[PDB]
């Protein structure tokens, strides 16, 4: 029995992609996902969709609730979460509208928390240090991929996400210091949601769309709020023929393994007094 | 009509630049900013000053509320911004009691509020996203680069600052990475004061007096409060006149169509609900 | 007259270290200390153990109150502050098990209070801008070097730390690029605890514990919670008999001309109104 929670980023969270839609409004004990809960399905599985920015797009990048969007997918029982995000790219190969199934972060966000385990939850009790070493499931992330190859869609099977404070884009010389630290795309939110999904044993995959150059080319145009929304309109019907592909193979793939494996790597990381 | 901002830094905020001086204290809806404005004139053209650490220097670089103090040189009609900073060099041909007109930054503070859009203030409506491509206005720099010239001073046509948090000074270690990352001066000030100015559609420019050089000289003396001040006290007088013969030809410039751009590159990196 | 403050880190925070053992709870302005100050001896020599997580571990390392813990040490009359700190390598010739005398920090915190100097406090009036060129005491770190010699322990005589937030660990693009940066050996503690200390002219050094390869050996099995504990139990003694052995050589060397500028270099790193 698996559960896809679809958290959808800007552009790319339309709640259209399911069937058999219900609205949901829940509360954690973060406080409030961004919004309500949509469940559905796509074929026979079940999803619960979930837009990271609420659904009028009203919470800067910063100020989500990272915290109560996982706590609240996990509590709906979800086992697994891919999600969509918008991005810089950071290298000439990836242009924009191509599908980055990213499988590296760095981490430049600062005001995030980015623990269950803070102390003030008797939910998640002591201090846990989740490994990171692999972020992003492996095994769905070559679902993704192979399901891309299957549509002809141009997309990259690996790389790596910065992901800035924001809300602010960046400078030239910070688009070109992340170039040298060896990041291929950039953008606000994938730090601490990937990092969350691991405390909660959730198996995540980020479907990153590149929607301009950042700023690193001085010769050309950079970055700007409507460059990258007129990007996402052009091509975020390429995601959602993505989700729409993937979710059936992952119904019909088997996951007690990797699920256990998850859930036991989470458990150890956990120290009690 | 110009309106030129003064945001004086350490050692380098006299309020005796300007003649007809009128004391004003403001409130802003980040709160108060850091000092009084000074209102007075350079020549024929208005300009308000304003201390950054308060005329006693009592105020932390953490602690600056630079979200007031940019509100507050907006809302005074300032259309022109122009500061002085005091830096560490981390190159060898920027020497203490260089000018260095700076053109880039890279972010390394960590608790500050970077925008007025932060969904706690009906005055700043929306998510806002500015681009930080271009973050000095150029046409500002070329004049404070051409008079600097004029004036026979030692003067740096470009560089990259990296803003530390503070209020430490930084490790060996650190001052050695930040050279590697392309840094030439570090200070702790001017991120996020030039996000806001962006943010504000104002035209922002940096003045920075090179007055030590960090610590990535093992062999050379460390910087020390005591070290920076020193050579503050000896070099102030030529920011003092650098700005004095900049700003009249600020005045007699034309500056509708830039101002028009700076104005809508801040309102189209808002979006609305 | 010398007084050596011992703050111990993951596995690594033994009492019984000490002889002639006394409890004391203090409060400081900062708030409590993480745990009961441990007054006792080393031969003739008074120390104060103060274990970093509280004695049952149950303090994340975002938390932990370094502001109290220095404040407290320094108002008991410590001199020294020699710590223990479980730690990753960054190295293939930094071995699991072995000890490293770090001399340099880089800072990848995000939510620490740095500074005694918030505003906040009359215990400590104005704005402190201390250096860190050299952040760690060299005489002490040079009796630590000479000490594990002399007990034919795996010792390296420097080292560069990288300070993480946490709680989670780093992510492999994040392992590589700290390794480009030039940073040897990784952890969640050393960043402020040093900082602090200098600003309470305090020599402090540390002993850090190499417990594992952090995850830059994609080959290799990644660090976790289990690892990391399985190591300290295996290694612990080593750094008991290393500070057992190098607090007697400490307490009869010569001090106050070290203190003496400390004490300076502390004092006037302060701007006062
Ligand atoms: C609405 S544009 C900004 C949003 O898109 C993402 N984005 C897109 C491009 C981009 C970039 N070049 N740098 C950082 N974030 C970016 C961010 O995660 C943010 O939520
Ligand atoms: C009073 S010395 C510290 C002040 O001077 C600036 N400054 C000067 C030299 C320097 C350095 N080497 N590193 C960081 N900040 C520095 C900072 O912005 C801070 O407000
Ligand atoms: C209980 S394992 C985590 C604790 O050990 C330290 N530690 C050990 C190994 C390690 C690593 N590879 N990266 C970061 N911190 C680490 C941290 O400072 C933290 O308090
Ligand atoms: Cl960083």
């Not at 002591?126 to 070559?142: L, N, S, Y």
């Not at 996400?161 to 606000?188: L, Q």
């Not at 150059?213 to 990007?231: I, P």
Request: charged share 25%; aromatic share 6%; with cysteine.
């Amino acid at each position: 029995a698996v559960k896809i929670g679809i958290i959808g980023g800007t552009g790319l969270d339309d709640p259209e992609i399911l069937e058999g839609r219900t609205e949901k409004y829940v509360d954690t004990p973060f406080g409030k996902p961004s919004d309500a809960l949509i469940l559905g399905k796509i074929k026979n599985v079940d999803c619960v969709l979930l837009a990271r920015h609420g659904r009028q797009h009203t919470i800067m990048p910063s100020k989500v609730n990272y915290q109560a969007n996982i706590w609240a997918l996990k509590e709906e029982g979800c086992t697994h979460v891919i999600v969509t995000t918008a991005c810089g790219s950071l290298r000439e190969e990836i242009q924009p509208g191509d599908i980055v199934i990213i499988d590296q972060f760095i981490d430049r966000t600062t005001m995030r928390p980015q623990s269950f385990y803070d102390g003030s939850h008797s939910c998640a009790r002591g201090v846990c240090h989740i490994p990171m070493a692999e972020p992003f499931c492996p095994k769905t992330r070559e679902v993704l991929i192979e399901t891309a190859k299957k549509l002809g869609l141009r997309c990259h099977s690996k790389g790596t996400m910065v992901t800035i404070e924001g809300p602010r884009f960046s400078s030239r010389a910070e688009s070109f210091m992340f170039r040298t630290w060896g990041a291929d795309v950039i953008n606000m939110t994938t730090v601490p949601e990937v990092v969350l999904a691991k405390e909660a044993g959730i198996c995540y995959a980020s479907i990153a769309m590149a929607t301009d150059y950042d700023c690193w080319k001085e010769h050309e145009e950079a970055v700007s709020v409507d460059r990258v929304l007129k990007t996402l309109k052009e091509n975020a019907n390429k995601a959602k023929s993505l989700l729409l592909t993937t979710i059936p193979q992952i119904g019909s793939t088997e996951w007690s393994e990797t699920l256990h494996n998850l859930k036991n790597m989470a458990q150890f990381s956990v120290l009690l007094p």
